[PDB]
Design an enzyme around this catalytic site. Sequence first.
Site, PDB file in Angstrom:
ATOM      1  N   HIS A 248       0.848  -1.226   0.000  1.00 32.45           N
ATOM      2  CA  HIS A 248       0.000   0.000   0.000  1.00 32.45           C
ATOM      3  C   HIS A 248       0.876   1.267   0.000  1.00 32.45           C
ATOM      4  CE1 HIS A 248       0.437   1.256   4.183  1.00 32.45           C
ATOM      5  NE2 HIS A 248       0.121   0.023   4.611  1.00 32.45           N
TER       6      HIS A 248
ATOM      7  N   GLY B 142       2.629   6.492   9.203  1.00 37.37           N
ATOM      8  CA  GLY B 142       3.986   6.192   8.710  1.00 37.37           C
ATOM      9  C   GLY B 142       4.616   5.009   9.429  1.00 37.37           C
TER      10      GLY B 142
ATOM     11  N   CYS C 243       3.718   2.021   9.299  1.00 32.19           N
ATOM     12  CA  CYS C 243       3.599   0.881   8.352  1.00 32.19           C
ATOM     13  C   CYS C 243       4.979   0.394   7.909  1.00 32.19           C
ATOM     14  CB  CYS C 243       2.749   1.278   7.155  1.00 32.19           C
ATOM     15  SG  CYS C 243       1.153   1.945   7.673  1.00 32.19           S
TER      16      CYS C 243
HETATM   17  C1  LIG Z   1      -7.707   4.202   9.423  1.00 33.31           C
HETATM   18  C2  LIG Z   1      -6.450   3.578   8.898  1.00 33.31           C
HETATM   19  N1  LIG Z   1      -5.278   4.478   9.023  1.00 33.31           N
HETATM   20  C3  LIG Z   1      -3.933   3.855   8.757  1.00 33.31           C
HETATM   21  O1  LIG Z   1      -3.845   2.687   8.456  1.00 33.31           O
HETATM   22  C4  LIG Z   1      -2.665   4.718   8.914  1.00 33.31           C
HETATM   23  C5  LIG Z   1      -2.073   4.169  10.215  1.00 33.31           C
HETATM   24  C6  LIG Z   1      -2.250   4.930  11.406  1.00 33.31           C
HETATM   25  C7  LIG Z   1      -1.733   4.410  12.594  1.00 33.31           C
HETATM   26  C8  LIG Z   1      -1.103   3.208  12.540  1.00 33.31           C
HETATM   27  N2  LIG Z   1      -0.976   2.497  11.401  1.00 33.31           N
HETATM   28  C9  LIG Z   1      -1.451   2.959  10.235  1.00 33.31           C
HETATM   29  N3  LIG Z   1      -1.783   4.619   7.774  1.00 33.31           N
HETATM   30  C10 LIG Z   1      -0.371   5.118   7.768  1.00 33.31           C
HETATM   31  O2  LIG Z   1       0.100   5.608   8.756  1.00 33.31           O
HETATM   32  C11 LIG Z   1       0.540   5.048   6.484  1.00 33.31           C
HETATM   33  C12 LIG Z   1       0.123   5.245   5.148  1.00 33.31           C
HETATM   34  C13 LIG Z   1       1.227   5.126   4.344  1.00 33.31           C
HETATM   35  C14 LIG Z   1       2.312   4.891   5.184  1.00 33.31           C
HETATM   36  O3  LIG Z   1       1.865   4.859   6.467  1.00 33.31           O
HETATM   37  C15 LIG Z   1      -2.302   4.044   6.504  1.00 33.31           C
HETATM   38  C16 LIG Z   1      -3.079   4.848   5.672  1.00 33.31           C
HETATM   39  C17 LIG Z   1      -3.556   4.306   4.490  1.00 33.31           C
HETATM   40  C18 LIG Z   1      -3.280   2.970   4.172  1.00 33.31           C
HETATM   41  C19 LIG Z   1      -3.774   2.406   2.864  1.00 33.31           C
HETATM   42  C20 LIG Z   1      -3.756   3.280   1.721  1.00 33.31           C
HETATM   43  C21 LIG Z   1      -4.167   2.821   0.495  1.00 33.31           C
HETATM   44  C22 LIG Z   1      -4.582   1.494   0.372  1.00 33.31           C
HETATM   45  C23 LIG Z   1      -4.590   0.626   1.504  1.00 33.31           C
HETATM   46  C24 LIG Z   1      -4.175   1.080   2.741  1.00 33.31           C
HETATM   47  C25 LIG Z   1      -2.489   2.175   5.029  1.00 33.31           C
HETATM   48  C26 LIG Z   1      -2.006   2.703   6.179  1.00 33.31           C
HETATM   49  C27 LIG Z   1      -6.610   3.091   7.418  1.00 33.31           C
HETATM   50  C28 LIG Z   1      -6.529   3.982   6.369  1.00 33.31           C
HETATM   51  C29 LIG Z   1      -6.678   3.530   5.026  1.00 33.31           C
HETATM   52  C30 LIG Z   1      -6.904   2.168   4.779  1.00 33.31           C
HETATM   53  C31 LIG Z   1      -6.993   1.256   5.835  1.00 33.31           C
HETATM   54  C32 LIG Z   1      -6.837   1.711   7.161  1.00 33.31           C
END
Ligand SMILES: C[C@H](NC(=O)[C@@H](c1cccnc1)N(C(=O)c1ccco1)c1ccc(-c2ccccc2)cc1)c1ccccc1
Lengths: 303, 303
Positions: free
Chosen positions: A41, A143, A145
């Site tokens: 992702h 971030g 991830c």
């Molecule tokens: C609500 C949740 N919020 C999150 O997951 C947060 C995040 C907050 C704290 C700890 N762990 C991850 N998140 C990040 O911190 C991150 C993004 C990129 C690098 O890090 C993230 C945003 C987006 C994605 C993603 C994007 C496109 C397709 C599929 C998934 C994935 C991670 C979420 C958002 C989108 C999808 C699923 C869950």
Amino acid sequence: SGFRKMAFPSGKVEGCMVQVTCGTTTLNGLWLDDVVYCPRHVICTSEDMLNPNYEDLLIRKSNHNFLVQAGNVQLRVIGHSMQNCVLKLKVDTANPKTPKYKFVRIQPGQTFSVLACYNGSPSGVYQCAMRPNFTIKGSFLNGSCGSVGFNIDYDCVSFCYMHHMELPTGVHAGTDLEGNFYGPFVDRQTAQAAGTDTTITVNVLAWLYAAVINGDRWFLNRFTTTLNDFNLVAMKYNYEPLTQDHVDILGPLSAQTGIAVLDMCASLKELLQNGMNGRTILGSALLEDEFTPFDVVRQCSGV
Amino acid sequence: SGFRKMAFPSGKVEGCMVQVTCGTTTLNGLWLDDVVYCPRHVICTSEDMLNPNYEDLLIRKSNHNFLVQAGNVQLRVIGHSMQNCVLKLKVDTANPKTPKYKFVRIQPGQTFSVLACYNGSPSGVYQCAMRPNFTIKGSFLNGSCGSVGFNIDYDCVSFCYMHHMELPTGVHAGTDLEGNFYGPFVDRQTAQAAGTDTTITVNVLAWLYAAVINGDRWFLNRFTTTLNDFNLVAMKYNYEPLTQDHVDILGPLSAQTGIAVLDMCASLKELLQNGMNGRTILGSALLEDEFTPFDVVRQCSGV
Ligand SMILES: C[C@H](NC(=O)[C@@H](c1cccnc1)N(C(=O)c1ccco1)c1ccc(-c2ccccc2)cc1)c1ccccc1
Ligand SMILES: C[C@H](NC(=O)[C@@H](c1cccnc1)N(C(=O)c1ccco1)c1ccc(-c2ccccc2)cc1)c1ccccc1
């Protein structure tokens, strides 16, 4: 004596954490040999969150679209591939701090150390358990991830987890390093509710055994129980059914503390039926289930 | 989101952990530059425990009596000295993994990461607080001594603790890296009772602020209080008197959560007077005081 939520030393894994930028998106990669593993992702954009097609989203991306930064040093991405929900970015340079390593897929109830990372920088370490609903109650921010959960077998770092996403419920979902999510979670922004978070009964019993070993023995009764009778009360309290394996796995602690496993099940029953009566065990006012029998043995034999 | 007992990455400190053998006795040393720091009770024998005279016990020892082993490699001890309750073993070789470092003496209530070690081998990592009685509720087994507590300021490892002894009460006492025990503890086998273990009020407030930031906001009432009125109830519950500094130190969290510090004191009062009513905050059934305002900021800004 004493008993704390202990992690493995993160040093071996620190030396493997790189930053992985794909356009606007930045997260952590694990650099082992000539391969950088990160959540796929990374490739997803501002509207791809809902229903991203990764194969489709990968075509648009090339080796030079994956900015792999090891501290201050950019790495040459000389080939990339998708394995389930992870990208494997081939780099020209083997990680010289590559520890001896395995990718294990860990059973639910098993524990691992998380090295939380932001921009390939280790932020912190904490012990986690794989919840029986295959979530992990992590501390991850944006971030975070591509942060890995892991277990160290002396020299050998057994990478069991790569962190992907937070669920709508403050709880965390991710994959093994083969990219397979634990549980039914998918790398998409859709309704993903946690199942029942059941208590890792064998771990609570191990924690009680750690409690008894550390002189916290008050919750011991003069009672015993049967697996079946205990399991009746366990299920009521959303506790994992206890098995002969669990009893066998607790054999070490039983033998160590000279307390039959079923007498401890008897104490657990009284704790579950009667609560803790304002009392604490190992500085906890609830029954900790995020320590394995192995974890207790380790923290009480000094491996 | 999510909130866990997080340690700093131990990697920088792992590379500093050596084994220190003096005759039968073995424990951990910290190898920085051309100096190996260990508890001076390494030099003490099977009957020296009760009233050891260290100056006297050091005369009998020479450079070649201090077996400093860095993994599989013995180090040449080319000079030794006693600084308070630590030996500083000069070695011919600078530790090439020496991180940028400071020796800080940490105030009670401050937290640090412990890298627990046995035979100069990192065993595990966990976050600790300096208790207001200058004990630490550690996990240390036999040989754990010379394990360091530390804090990382980006590149700079601030060594605040070297572990010396377990008190009769399963609780741990040790020194700064200048060898000065926190509290009234002495490296002797005598009656050393812990003082009152008071709750680090400012840390509990920070933890509540972390709880609110992570969506656990149930314990919020419609009440406020005055520092003085709150402190009256704090003292009853063996909570550290709260100061304007504590309020100032919580300013960040207040500003972040838009919750006046004194409204949180009001919630803490209701939690203290009424208990938690079987409820949990941040997966705890009691009020965690081993997270600083800085720790919460760190784990909720991703430093
Ligand atoms: C609500 C949740 N919020 C999150 O997951 C947060 C995040 C907050 C704290 C700890 N762990 C991850 N998140 C990040 O911190 C991150 C993004 C990129 C690098 O890090 C993230 C945003 C987006 C994605 C993603 C994007 C496109 C397709 C599929 C998934 C994935 C991670 C979420 C958002 C989108 C999808 C699923 C869950
Ligand atoms: C009861 C306590 N038991 C301990 O302190 C245990 C120990 C158990 C778990 C965690 N932390 C330390 N302990 C060790 O594991 C150890 C010893 C050497 C290397 O490691 C130890 C034994 C002895 C000493 C010592 C010896 C001579 C003079 C002054 C002090 C110091 C430490 C204790 C024993 C003696 C004195 C004070 C407290």
